[PDB]
C-alpha cells in the first residue's frame, strides 16, 4: 500500500462511548477514555510518559485479542530493543506489529515513518478488525518536519516552526480514526518542548485527542509517579450520561478540592500554614491526602523501585476518593497513603507507620 | 560521521560500571552502554565527577575517553596533568578544543571522540568517553548555523540542534555477539561491546526546563542533577534526588546493591519535599523524629571527599548500616566519624568478606546474617 | 537496709572503675590504630609521588 | 606587533598553579589570585575602584617587579583623566603603559582597543615578567562587537548578542595566561546588565573568571578601606 | 551515700567520654602532621629525581 | 430580566471588592460578612448543568 493516503469520509466515521478500564487510579478516576477513542500523554523530558505507555501495553494490549500496532518515531534505540525482547520472551510478538524510525536516522525516516505505521493499521481496521495503534512520540513528527522545512525554501512562522504545521499535524491525524467498519484504539506520546504547554506544537495537538493526560515535573520530583496533573487532564467521555452519576461526581470533588489547595499555596507560602482558617487546614490535608493516593506502583516500574505492581479497578477506586473526601480517612497519617494499591492496602499500611 | 546500530544490534545493559561515589553508584547506577547525563550549575563538581569516574577504571578493563570542547586551555593542562599523577592517562585519549580553537572544531570535536570510542566498541570491547560540555558545542553549533543564515527557532537556537545531539550520543551503545562477530569479520567470538557517555550540559541558575538541557534529558538514559544549595551546605557531591534518576534502573546494579538501595531515592524525594514544608513545626514527633534522622543522616552519609573512591563491598555494609535503621542511634555530626571506623573495621576483622563481595554479586540468606554479625561486632566497640 | 546502702555503694563504684576503665583502653587501641593507619597511608602516597 | 595573534599553544603553558600576592589582606586571605588568572571587580561607583587598582599597580611593580597595562575600553573620558591625574600625583604613572578608547570612539576603536593592550603585556611577558592587565569594561567590549556584528549584517543571537559572541571573547581571555617564561594575570572590571547573571554576556564572562571581588557602598560608609566584601567575594 | 555514689559514679563516665575524644582527637591530629610531613618530604625526593 | 439583572450586577461588584478578605474573613465584621456571604450564594446560583437551558420565567424566578 502506499503510505500516502486520504482520510476516511465523515459518512463513515463511528461513535462508540463503550468505556475501556485501565488499572491505573488516576487515568480511569479523571481521565477515562473508550474503546475506539484517542488517547495522549503530554509531558516534558523525563516525566513518565514512556512508562505509563509500556503499562497501558500490559494493561490493554495483552488482554486484547485483536492485533496490535507499534510505530516508534524519533525515539532511543535502546528503548526499541527492550520493548522487541519483552514482546519475545513472552510470546506476544506474534500479535504486534513494530515499525521503527529512532533517533539515529536522518529527517527523511523520522518524517515518514509515522505514515508507515498508520498504514499497516488502517489495513488491519480495512479487514473488519479492532486495532491498538501505539506511537512512541508523535513530537518527533513535525520536529523532522522544522528540521527540513527551510531547506524547502519556506518561509518560518511563529516559534520557527514551519509555516505548515497544523496541516502536517492534521493530515496525519485525520486518518487514524475508528470507523463503521473497524476501529482503531490509539495511545500517543506528545514531547512538550521546554516544558512549555503554549508551544504551537502541544498547543495544536489537544484538539486532536478525545483523552489528555498532562504529566508534570513539578510533581515527579516530589516521587508521586504516575506524575499526572488532575487540573489539566481531561476527557471527552468524563459526562454523567456516559461514566455516570457517581463517578462524574467524585472526580468533579476531587478537582474542587485540589482547586482550592492551589489557591492557597500563595498565603501558605507567606504567612505559613497557621492562618488558615480552621476548615481549610481540613481542606489542605486531605488535599495532600489525595495527592499521595493519586499515586500507584506500576508493573513495569518495579526495576525501578522494587516494591510490586497494583492493579486498582474503577470501582475499587471510586470507593476510595469518595472516602477521603468525606473525611472517613482523618485519623491516618500522610505516608500511609502513598504508593499503594486498594484503599484497603492504605488502611493497612498505617499500622506499620 | 556515522549511524549507530539498528534495533536488533544492540543488547540491554547488564553490567555495572563503578564510579567511586556512594551516591550515584546506589541512587543513579551507571551500566556499560548506558548514557548518563551529568547536569548542573557552573563550579558544582561536574568535572571532578566525570574524571573521578574516569581514575576509577584504571584497573577494571575500560578503555576511557575525555573529550573538552570549549573549555580554558588552562584548565584542560591541569586535568591531564590529575589524571597523569593518579596513573590513570596511559589508559585514557584526550581530545581538546580550546575555547580559542574555531567553532568547526568545537562542533565536531565530539563526533572525533565517538570515532574513537567506537573502535572499542565495535572489536567486543568496553570504553567510556565524556564529552566535557555539549552546551559548548551546542553553541558553537549554533555559531556556525547563524552564519549561514539559516532561520533560528527558540532560544536562537538551529531548527536541527535536537538532531545534533542524538546522532551523536545514540551511538553510545552496547552491542552483541553477532553484530562484533559480522563486523570484525569472524575475528572475535562470543563477546559483546559497549561504548559508555557521560555528556556534561551546564544550566544557567538551575533551570533544568530550558530548550538545551531539556533537548539533552531526553536523549540520555538519566541524569544526575548538582545542585547549587546542596554544594554550598557542604553536601558533595551535590547529588539532588527526586531530580536525578537512571532509566535502566537495578539492573545495571550488583545484586547486593541493587537490594541494598531499593527505593532510597524516592525516599529522599520524599523526605526533601517533607522537610520543606514542615519547615514549622512536626507530627508523630517521634515518628518524624526517626525518620527527618535517617531522611537526614543518608544526606549526611553519602557526602564523600574527592579522590577518594570506595569499592563495592565497602558502599554495600554502608548502604546495610543506613537503611537496616542501625543509624537511629547516632547524631549527625557522628556519622563521617562512624563510617571512618567502620570501614576500618571489617579491614581488620572481616577482612576476607570484603573480597569477597568485591568479586561477586554475593547476596544470600547467609550474607545478610554475616552483615548483622559485622554490624554488632562494631557497634558495641567503637 | 543499711547495708543494701552499703551494697550499692560498693557496687556502683566498682562498676565506674569498669566502664571509666575500659572506656579509656579502648579509646588508647583507636589511637594505636589510627596512627598505624597513618602509617599504612602516608608510605602508599609515597609510591604514587614516585611513579608520577 | 600585530595586534592579532594565536593563544598560547598548549605545550607552552606553565606547567603549575600558582598564586600572586597582592599584599591587600582581604583579597590574599578571602579571594587569592591566581598567577596567570582572570579576576572580576564587581564593584560598582564611590567605593575606589580606581585606588584599589593604583594600589596593585603599585605592589606589583615594587614587591614583585611587573608592569601594568590600563586598557580603557569605553568609558567615560572624564574618568580616564582624573584617573590619568590620580596617578600622576601618586608616582606610580611611571609603572604602568596606558591605552583609551572611550564612548566617543567609533565602534571599530572600541572594538580593537582592548587587544592593543594586550598585545603590550604580551611583549612584556616575553621580557620574562609578572604581567597585570587591567580592562576598565569587559561589557563595552562585548557590546563594541555586537555594534560591529550588527553593521556587517549577521543575524542576532540569543537575546540580540552577534553569534560570535564566546568565540570573541574566548579569542581575547584566551591569550592572558601564565606560561613558561612569564604570565599576564587581569583584573576586569565587570557589569550585569538589568541585574541579571544569566544574561549572555555575563554568562559567557564568568566562565572566563578565576577569583571575584565585590566591593560594598557599607562597608566603605563605615569607613573600612579597602571596601571589599568579604562575603560576596570568592575565589575558585 | 546512696545518693552520693549514684552521683560520682557516673562523673567518671562523663569524665571519660571526654578524655575519650581527646586521646581520639589528639591521634588524627598526630596522623594529619604524619601525612603532611611524609607528603612534603617525598616532594623532595620527586623533584631531585626529575631534575637530575 | 432588565429589572432584575440589575441587583446582581451590584451584587457581584461588591463580592468583587470584597473577595480579597475571604481568607481572612473570621476577623470582618458582620456588616461586610453579609456582603461577603451574599455574593458566594449569588455566585453559586449561577452555576448551570449542560444541556439543561432555563426558559425566561425560570431564570427570572430564580434571580428575583
Ligand atoms: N566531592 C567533593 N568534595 C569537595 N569538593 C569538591 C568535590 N567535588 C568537587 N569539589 C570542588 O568543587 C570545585 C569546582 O568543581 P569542578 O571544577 O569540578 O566543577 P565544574 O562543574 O567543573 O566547574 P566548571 O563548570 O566551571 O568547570 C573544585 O575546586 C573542587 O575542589
Ligand atoms: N511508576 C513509576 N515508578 C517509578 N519511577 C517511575 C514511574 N514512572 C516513571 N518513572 C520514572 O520516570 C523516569 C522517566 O522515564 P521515561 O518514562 O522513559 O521518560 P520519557 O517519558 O521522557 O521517556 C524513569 O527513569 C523512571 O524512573
Ligand atoms: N584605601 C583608602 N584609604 C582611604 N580612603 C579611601 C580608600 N579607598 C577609598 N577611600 C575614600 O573613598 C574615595 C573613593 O574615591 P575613588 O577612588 O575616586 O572611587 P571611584 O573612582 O570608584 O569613585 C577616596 O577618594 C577616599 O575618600
Ligand atoms: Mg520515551
Ligand atoms: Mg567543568
Same mark, same amino acid.
Given at each position: 500500500w502506499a503510505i500516502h493516503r486520504a482520510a476516511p469520509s465523515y459518512e463513515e466515521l463511528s461513535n462508540s462511548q463503550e $468505556?475501556?478500564?485501565?488499572?491505573?487510579?488516576?487515568?480511569?478516576?479523571?481521565?477515562? +477514555?473508550?474503546? %475506539?477513542?484517542?488517547?495522549?500523554? +503530554? %509531558?516534558?523530558? /523525563?516525566? /513518565?510518559?514512556?512508562?505509563?505507555? =509500556?503499562?497501558?501495553? &500490559?494493561?490493554?494490549?495483552?488482554?486484547?485479542?485483536? *492485533?496490535?500496532?507499534?510505530?516508534?518515531? /524519533?525515539? &532511543?534505540?535502546? !528503548?526499541?530493543?527492550? +520493548?522487541?525482547?519483552?514482546?519475545?520472551?513472552?510470546?506476544?510478538?506474534?500479535?504486534?506489529?513494530?515499525?521503527?524510525?529512532?533517533?539515529?536516522?536522518?529527517?527523511?525516516?523520522?518524517?515518514? #515513518?509515522?505514515?508507515?505505521? $498508520?498504514?499497516?493499521?488502517?489495513? +488491519?481496521?480495512? !479487514? /473488519?478488525?479492532?486495532?491498538?495503534?501505539?506511537?512512541?512520540?508523535? *513530537?518527533? *513528527?513535525?520536529?523532522?518536519?522544522?528540521?527540513?522545512?527551510?531547506?524547502?525554501?519556506?518561509?518560518?512562522?511563529?516559534? %520557527?516552526?514551519?509555516?505548515?504545521?497544523?496541516?502536517? =499535524?492534521?493530515?496525519?491525524?485525520?486518518?487514524?480514526? @475508528?470507523?463503521?467498519?473497524? @476501529?482503531?484504539? @490509539?495511545?500517543?506520546?506528545?514531547? #512538550?518542548?521546554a516544558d512549555d504547554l503554549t508551544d504551537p506544537s502541544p498547543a495544536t495537538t489537544f484538539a486532536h485527542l478525545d483523552a489528555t493526560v498532562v504529566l508534570s515535573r513539578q510533581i515527579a520530583s516530589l516521587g508521586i509517579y504516575p506524575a499526572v496533573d488532575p487540573l489539566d487532564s481531561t476527557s471527552r467521555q468524563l459526562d454523567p450520561l456516559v461514566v455516570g452519576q457517581e463517578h462524574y461526581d467524585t472526580a468533579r470533588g476531587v478537582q474542587s478540592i485540589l482547586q482550592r489547595y492551589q489557591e492557597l499555596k500563595d498565603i501558605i507560602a507567606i504567612l505559613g500554614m497557621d492562618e488558615l482558617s480552621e476548615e481549610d487546614k481540613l481542606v489542605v490535608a486531605r488535599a495532600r491526602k489525595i495527592q499521595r493516593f493519586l499515586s500507584q506502583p506500576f508493573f513495569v516500574a518495579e526495576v525501578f523501585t522494587g516494591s510490586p505492581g497494583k492493579y486498582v479497578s474503577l470501582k475499587d477506586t471510586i470507593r476510595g476518593f469518595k472516602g477521603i473526601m468525606e473525611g472517613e480517612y482523618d485519623h491516618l497519617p500522610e505516608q500511609a497513603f502513598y504508593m499503594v494499591g486498594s484503599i484497603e492496602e492504605a488502611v493497612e499500611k498505617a499500622k506499620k507507620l | 560521521e556515522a549511524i549507530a546500530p539498528g534495533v536488533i544490534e544492540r543488547q540491554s545493559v547488564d553490567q555495572p560500571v563503578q564510579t567511586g561515589y556512594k551516591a550515584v553508584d546506589s541512587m543513579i547506577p551507571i551500566g556499560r552502554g548506558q548514557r548518563e547525563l551529568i547536569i548542573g550549575d557552573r563550579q558544582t563538581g561536574k568535572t571532578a565527577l566525570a574524571i573521578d569516574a574516569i581514575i576509577n577504571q584504571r584497573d577494571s578493563g575500560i578503555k576511557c575517553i575525555y573529550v573538552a570542547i570549549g573549555q580554558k586551555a588552562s584548565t584542560i593542562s591541569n586535568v591531564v596533568r590529575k589524571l597523569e599523577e593518579h596513573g590513570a592517562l596511559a589508559n585514557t585519549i584526550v581530545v581538546v578544543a580550546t575555547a580559542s580553537e574555531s567553532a568547526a572544531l568545537q562542533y565536531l570535536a565530539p563526533y572525533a571522540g565517538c570515532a574513537m570510542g567506537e573502535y572499542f566498541r565495535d572489536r567486543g570491547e568496553d570504553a567510556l568517553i565524556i564529552y566535557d560540555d555539549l552546551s559548548k558545542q551546542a553553541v558553537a553549533y549554533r555559531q556556525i548555523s547563524l552564519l549561514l543564515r539559516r532561520p533560528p527557532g527558540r532560544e536562537a537556537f538551529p531548527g536541527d540542534v535536537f538532531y545534533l545531539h542524538s546522532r551523536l550520543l545514540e551511538r553510545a551503545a552496547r552491542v552483541n555477539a553477532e553484530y562484533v562477530e559480522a563486523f570484525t569479520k569472524g575475528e572475535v567470538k562470543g563477546k559483546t561491546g559497549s561504548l559508555t557517555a557521560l555528556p556534561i550540559i551546564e544550566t544557567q541558575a538551575g533551570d533544568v526546563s530550558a530548550f538545551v538541557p531539556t533537548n539533552v534529558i531526553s536523549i540520555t538514559d538519566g541524569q544526575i542533577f548538582l545542585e547549587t544549595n546542596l554544594f554550598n551546605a557542604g553536601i558533595r557531591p551535590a547529588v539532588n534526588p527526586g531530580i536525578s534518576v537512571s532509566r535502566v534502573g537495578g539492573a545495571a546494579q550488583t545484586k547486593i546493591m541493587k537490594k541494598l538501595s531499593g527505593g532510597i531515592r524516592t525516599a529522599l524525594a520524599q523526605y526533601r519535599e517533607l522537610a520543606a514544608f514542615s519547615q514549622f513545626a512536626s507530627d508523630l514527633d517521634d515518628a518524624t523524629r526517626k525518620q527527618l534522622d535517617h531522611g537526614q543522616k543518608?544526606?549526611?552519609?553519602?557526602?564523600?571527599?574527592?579522590?577518594?573512591?570506595?569499592?563495592?563491598?565497602?558502599?554495600?555494609?554502608?548502604?546495610?548500616?543506613?537503611?537496616?535503621?542501625?543509624?537511629?542511634?547516632?547524631?549527625?555530626?557522628?556519622?563521617?566519624?562512624?563510617?571512618?571506623?567502620?570501614?576500618?573495621?571489617?579491614?581488620?576483622?572481616?577482612?576476607?568478606?570484603?573480597?569477597?563481595?568485591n568479586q561477586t554479586g554475593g547476596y544470600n540468606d547467609e550474607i545478610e546474617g554475616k552483615l548483622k554479625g559485622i554490624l554488632d561486632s562494631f557497634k558495641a566497640t567503637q | 537496709d543499711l547495708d543494701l546502702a552499703k551494697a550499692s555503694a560498693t557496687d556502683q563504684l566498682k562498676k565506674a572503675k569498669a566502664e571509666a576503665q575500659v572506656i579509656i583502653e579502648q579509646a588508647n587501641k583507636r589511637r594505636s590504630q589510627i596512627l598505624d593507619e597513618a602509617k599504612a597511608e602516608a608510605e602508599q602516597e609515597r609510591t604514587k609521588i614516585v611513579a608520577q
Open positions: $468505556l475501556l478500564e485501565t488499572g491505573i487510579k488516576v487515568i480511569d478516576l479523571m481521565a477515562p +477514555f473508550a474503546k %475506539g477513542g484517542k488517547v495522549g500523554l +503530554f %509531558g516534558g523530558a /523525563g516525566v /513518565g510518559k514512556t512508562v505509563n505507555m =509500556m503499562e497501558l501495553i &500490559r494493561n490493554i494490549a495483552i488482554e486484547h485479542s485483536g *492485533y496490535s500496532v507499534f510505530a516508534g518515531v /524519533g525515539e &532511543r534505540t535502546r !528503548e526499541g530493543n527492550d +520493548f522487541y525482547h519483552e514482546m519475545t520472551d513472552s510470546n506476544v510478538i506474534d500479535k504486534v506489529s513494530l515499525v521503527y524510525g529512532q533517533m539515529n536516522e536522518p529527517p527523511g525516516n523520522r518524517l515518514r #515513518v509515522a505514515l508507515t505505521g $498508520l498504514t499497516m493499521a488502517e489495513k +488491519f481496521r480495512d !479487514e /473488519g478488525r479492532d486495532v491498538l495503534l501505539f506511537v512512541d512520540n508523535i *513530537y518527533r *513528527y513535525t520536529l523532522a518536519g522544522t528540521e527540513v522545512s527551510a531547506l524547502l525554501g519556506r518561509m518560518p512562522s511563529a516559534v %520557527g516552526y514551519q509555516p505548515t504545521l497544523a496541516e502536517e =499535524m492534521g493530515v496525519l491525524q485525520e486518518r487514524i480514526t @475508528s470507523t463503521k467498519t473497524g @476501529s482503531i484504539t @490509539s495511545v500517543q506520546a506528545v514531547y #512538550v518542548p | 543518608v544526606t549526611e552519609l553519602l557526602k564523600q571527599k574527592q579522590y577518594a573512591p570506595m569499592s563495592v563491598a565497602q558502599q554495600s555494609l554502608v548502604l546495610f548500616a543506613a537503611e537496616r535503621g542501625y543509624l537511629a542511634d547516632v547524631e549527625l555530626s557522628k556519622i563521617g566519624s562512624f563510617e571512618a571506623a567502620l570501614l576500618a573495621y571489617v579491614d581488620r576483622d572481616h577482612a576476607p568478606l570484603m573480597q569477597e563481595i | -
